[PDB]
Amino acid sequence: MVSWFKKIFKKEEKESLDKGLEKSSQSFFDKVSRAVVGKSKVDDEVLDDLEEVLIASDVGVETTVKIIRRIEERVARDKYVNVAELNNILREEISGLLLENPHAGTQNKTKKPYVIMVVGVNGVGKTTTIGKLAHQFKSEGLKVVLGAADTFRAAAVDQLVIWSERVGVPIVKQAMGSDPASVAFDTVQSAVSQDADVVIIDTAGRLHNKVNLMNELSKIKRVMQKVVPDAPHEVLLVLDGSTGQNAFEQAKQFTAATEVTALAVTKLDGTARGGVVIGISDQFQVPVKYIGVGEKMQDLQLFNGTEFVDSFFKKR
């Protein structure tokens, strides 16, 4: 039974999710409306055109096939279905589909500190997501320590320092080009000495050489295990949802190079390719855990596929 990471939405939080998905929702409704103009009943041609719309909405081939198969079956049972019901049918069938992945949601604690290694390619929103996470945890009364283990560019450390100041959490850092594993070691040591609750490690994720990537991330993990044997407790892969299915393929490439435990999909706000979240949640054997809906430290949400699909497809 799928247990979502976020079970309760405040009014403002559901509004933030609706707003984050607004452009994707409007784009999808535009495409379906145009596809069924002059049609009355859902037939094989309508479902063919709906498959084309779902693909054009970055839902992905394998997920779209499953969705159309479920709708085909439902249409065959009900015989006469009006095309105006498609948004409602999609909401119901896709919500049901996401609940079928046993790897979605939480699986339901280890000794502090809880160590998070944030991974992904440059530009997807890793460091921003780390700032948002630090805010999430500090708002709960937890003590957060950041580790600046993205040391390839000098700007990288500067950017995490900037976020450490926006939220008001300590940071462990060395120089540009310092050994990332050594920074991670120092970060976890400091967190243990300071009795901190959460450690978040920033990393480079230069995917062009998967051997070097694999070796760097494995060294970071192995060295942290000298201090905390079951660290990292979470390996969070950050993906740019504004790139649609490009993020799905990137996640496939990245998760084949290193062990990931959860996904974050950023930049859903103000872009129209958010349907990729549906395909990722359906196909991946690790959960979507966070979605990003803006530039500010509050613009992070724990994932709930049922609410995501509701916001994506409901009438506005």
Next chain:
Amino acid sequence: MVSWFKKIFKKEEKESLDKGLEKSSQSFFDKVSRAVVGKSKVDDEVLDDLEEVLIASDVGVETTVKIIRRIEERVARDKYVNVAELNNILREEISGLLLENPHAGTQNIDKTKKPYVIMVVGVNGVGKTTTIGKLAHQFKSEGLKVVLGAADTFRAAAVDQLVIWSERVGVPIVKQAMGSDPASVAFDTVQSAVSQDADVVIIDTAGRLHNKVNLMNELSKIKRVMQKVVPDAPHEVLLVLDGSTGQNAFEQAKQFTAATEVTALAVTKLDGTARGGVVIGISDQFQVPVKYIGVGEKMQDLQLFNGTEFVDSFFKKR
């Protein structure tokens, strides 16, 4: 030995290719310049950063590995290589690499009896109908008689758009109504070309790739029905790809060529975009040739492909 589709470039033609690739060339030079600031000699770190630049330039993983392997080897032989030479080294090594694909260029097959039948295929929006207009202009300018077939009949404006191009160039068109059987339109087109003693037939097609079974069946029916009239038609199946989408076009070509037999590639929209490096990866990896590149909206903005000149325009100092 690779024989390019265009062997001689007039000065104006080389200028058109340079201009078409200007943004991709500037973008690449920006990336490599930034990557080697503060460096003097090419070392393993420089080559690693250069691999990242080539990937960021849409050249693709397999092609980039080959390029870096050759540069690694050349650096090892020469021991001391200045980072300023990277542009020259890339031009030389990538030019050599493209000549290694025996499927590149023309195979100089003996001519078949007129009409020469071209089926243009690809996904909506890549520039198929535009490319057909450009092809019609190319052939009419050579003194040939062109006939167009409006066998893209799904959407509202598809037939209208090919009519519009037939009028811009001034060539006849065979068409039916929206939703007409595309194979029947193709049959009528080839029949008309035979009776009019035409030299070239160009068939426009839909390419709804979301259901590859339906796509495969439609294109196969068009081919089979045209063979009732001209047994070796289509003589060319030209897959059009949008070069402004970079490696997305490489992946799309992989998906499309697995659904239907293609004989040649056209890569459009290189002008004014910065992802033209995908042409290098396509030419290296695909077992069908890049034959045409599109460098603009006008009927003249088509060139037969020459990989050596493409790489020269992509990497030469400006």
